[PDB]
Amino acid sequence: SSAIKTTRLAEAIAGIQLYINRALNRIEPNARADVSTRQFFTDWTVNN
Amino acid sequence: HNLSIDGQPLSLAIYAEPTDPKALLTSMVQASQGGSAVLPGTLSLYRF
Known about the structure:
Helix content of chain A is about 50%, strand content about 0%. With about 50 residues, chain A is an all-alpha fold. Chain B: This is XptA2 protein.
């Protein structure tokens, strides 16, 4: 609904988080699994 | 829809009460009309 209110930075955060989460769970095909093993993703539990 | 966890809306509306009607005011309405014409004068048999 239009009642929800956000800022550009908040939206971009949400989108990028969604993209990362989709990537990791292998729901996305053709994942570059080589890069999925990086340290940031290792700490994805506390960097989500 | 940006509600509570149970469906309570977070935003409250207004009633927008009307102006209410106006009491009709009546006025003295007058139509002008004349009086009766004089009649031709016959003469009597007594004195003044």
